[model samples]
Target: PHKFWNTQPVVQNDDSSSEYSFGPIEIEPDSFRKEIYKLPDGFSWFDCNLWDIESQDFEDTYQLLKDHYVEDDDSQFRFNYSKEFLRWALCVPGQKKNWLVGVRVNETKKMVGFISAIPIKVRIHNCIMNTSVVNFLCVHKKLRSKRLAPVLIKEITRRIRCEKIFQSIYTCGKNITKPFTIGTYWHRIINVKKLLEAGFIGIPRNMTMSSLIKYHRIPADKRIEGFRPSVDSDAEQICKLFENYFMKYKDVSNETMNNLINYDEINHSKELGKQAYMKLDKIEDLQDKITIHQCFNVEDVKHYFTNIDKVIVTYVRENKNKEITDLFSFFIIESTVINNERFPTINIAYSYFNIANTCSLKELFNEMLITAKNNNCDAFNTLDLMQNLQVIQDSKFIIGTGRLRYYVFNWKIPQISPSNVGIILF
Candidate 1:
């Protein structure tokens, strides 16, 4: 059982202790191994650069993920992360290029394996440590017997340790290690017709197709006064509101409020006739201009309002004085249908963060459903974290069968409940 995991610093299934304490499971060494781990014959290591979208490395990595990444249990659905979304998720503020690790065939020079790590600050109870968030760990299905998964994990860990970071947090649909907390997915159906056609859900025995569609229809008239999309100027207020609301939870990202909510538009600037500007020296200056162009403007607000192709969508409620009172946002993701020619893909929107001060939580979420529907999302998915469960039943969300288990590497602490967890992995 768990032959490789048994040798790591993770909590095991048989672990037991009488005292209630929390800290690192192992101490850091003065230095890590200088040489990289050896791979199987005819394979070599390569560092993937996600910043340059036109490069072959970027295309190879994207193709690899699209062909062999996460899939549903029955292999009917697979995540299809767009090139734009990948840039947004991997190329974050203060990112390390070396952490985008990959394995290539020596002869053909084709990428067959990949694992990435991003710098993150995490809080465990009273302790705050700089950690890495590892995601997209995958290998070609044909290479599954090559024992590449453990090597990928070890290589990423070694790379992270070189940066002087010891702990890490990752999530999986399956439970391979002792989990700190397990969270469930809740979905609010937006387009009943599309979902039914895709076989994502079936009609209930007690209800007809017409009744099901009528039951899941979102009210288009339920609009909140003074509600509008977030603009660049609203960053400070949104950050303040999010910081105060997220402090009540444990095991959450310690990123600055601005970094947590900052959405980059450089990836989509080609269509808007704006040249891509990603030089480190000009980032601070470029961020300001990008924000302004990404939101509503005086002329657009006076007429019809439209936004660029954005990865994240945020809406804020403001008072008469133009002060933000409540906000909610979600990110877009799509899943490719496997072997089903009728439906090619299913568009999904995942609830990211929300804070309601003037309005009730149910009211805020109800408006969120309407926004998601207006955006052409087939389903709205959220985790059973924070205040989500409180509004689940009232908002008509159906509980999914999937459970996302959170795991911390080289750290041990008392298990946290789903309600007390605040971190949302990409």
Candidate 2:
């Protein structure tokens, strides 16, 4: 919105390298507040978001990191917030060599904004080294009302003007040419009070606050009683259901539901499992029917991984050992190949482990990573914004940055919104 970002350019054409000061440092509260940044009123940064930059800003960045995460038993990374963990979590090894750019305010000459162009090595279908991941576009919250985001973006691009390390800066939501998007977040109402209030149905104990947070999984005993697991054959039907939630979505009346699944994107086919699913039973059959358990087509791997032309992989799972396979909490993964090379990268689309399932988070995390590794030859990667405490707690499952959705005004300013979000696993 303003002409805030105007840093010097530092072009390079190698695998990755950076030349900048104040690189990858947490923003201070005074600076962030002076920037007055935040989501529109009424909305708190998602309750289940872990990789939330993990800071709510309490005067100082270090204090916030310590007070919020370091004080808990079940907190992220055992609350120690180790350094090696930070290195891997911040992707220092990968990003350290990439384009790390920084900016300073004109008046006081204080660092106010920063952005980085990190390139990770991974394999999608063909072997290609994907360079230039436009990330870490952080400006003081106070500055959000102005034009820091665009400035940060333009400044970083200018710096890499002549370099050929990356074909494109794989930017999204930050007004990069067209807000490139590999994935979008999927959500389901796990809590009944919130659900019903939002025009949804049912509110049982299990669906109440007492529950620590799990997927809405109708118990097995209640399967034949009031609910039954959805089958793969139910794909078409489930596809229809999915449309209603997405099409009409938050509002209703004037229009009908939109039931259009990319088919190839869902990846699972009826041949692999059932096509779709329906709610044959309710939790009431088990005494409390507040939790609505529906099944997803976890089959059709071929439909999903057919040719692998820069695909996106996502899934919602059930937890047994550590426990989230209940209501409808889902996790997502967005991946693509870097020109089909041996050193390609796996991109994390959007992953939220807060499904209503009774599955364990630990086990679910492991399963998710394994699935991601199987799909692509991950060299460089970025995770969804949801992963919080666990961002770098587990080296095996560190939090990598993914793309966020932003908008730009061109010729006619094409129509766009959450519904516009789509996926192409092929």
Candidate 3:
């Protein structure tokens, strides 16, 4: 049996009665911001909170929003909050649900509170359809007490559900007690400096922490010594060590220090280091250095840093004549969902790069500019990957926010870690 509760936006005359109300929700884009267009009379947007989702105009606009989007203009009027939601939209297939909807209301038509719902493809009991997920939720900065956000959700979801396009809406996000759904994009971190100093022993196959420090000539006494997997020979040792380090914790995303190196090429090839600690015999092919077992895993850490070979990691040197230092590696992480026409989010586009620890940032940025174009992606997207910043300017990529709720209702989402999370990309 469905429960029906009558509700109204209006309040009673009694002084103690509370008030609740909301305005209409609509689709909008850039032009809809400041005011309503002439085509619709009495349809004025206060902040023009109007947004036009030209999903009608561009097929890969969603990708372009993240790929080609420039940093906030000097004026900051036209911004790209779209990246925040684009990943979900691109991953979600259409079944007639408007996973994305935009609305704008004027001050006179004051949207004290508003609800942002995203239509998405979801499955329930093996049945699938377009469903909405909450996004861009906000009430007028000025309107705090009124529950306009939920009101808008109720109205829009009611309509969407009425169409029978989807059975019910769900969120894998911030709402408190509702049953949340898990989305496909599991997140991972690529950095490693934060935990080692406290108590992390270097991976077994890895050179000792002191050796790593000595090879780089970093003063052992310095507090900020950076740690990374070696890229040259003896790659299997790197994989074995990473796999072992990975065993220390569970539930973390895999980030084997080895993925940045030749872990994949060396692990499987008989011509390579049999033990996880032999020096690489020759650095002929980076791909050969990576072993299938170390890169792909059904269980455990040896398989961290797995991805389609489409975005392989490579190192380019300053002087072609000098032995090219294995400086950095590039790997593309497109979504698992198949939509050739859909824009792919460049999840992990940068590399674990280092050139003398003092290379020209501009030169590296120019190199990235070339790389972004080479890949045919609009622009390069990066994680909080602090390692490569010295070579590449942080300005090239926008600092977007991502959140993963760790608990459902009152229960907790387990913490798993050697993971950097990549080792466990399970």
TM-scores, in order shown?
Answer: 0.84, 0.31, 0.29
Error of 3 at 188 (Å): 4.9
Cα RMSD for candidates in order: 11.6, 20.8, 20.5
Output the number of the TM-score-best candidate: 1
Cα lDDT of model 1 by residue, 251-318, tens digit: 32345322332112221223321222111222232221111001222432212112225466778888
Model 2's number of clashes is 78
Report the error of model 2 at residue 145, Å.
Answer: 5.0
Q: Compared with the true structure, what per-residue lDDT tens digits does model 3 show for residues 60-178?
A: 33332323222222222112324323332222323233333333344353233333343333211111223344444444444444444444555545444444322223333332332
lDDT of 2 by residue, 59-102 (tens): 22222233332111222121223322222223423344324444
Off by over 4 Å in 1: 248-310
Lowest-scoring 10 consecutive residues by lDDT in candidate 2? 286-295
Q: Which stretches of candidate 3 lie over 4 Å from their true place?
A: 1-80, 83-105, 108-121, 125-130, 172-175, 178-426
lDDT of each: 0.72, 0.30, 0.30
Q: Which residue pairs clash within candidate 1?
A: none
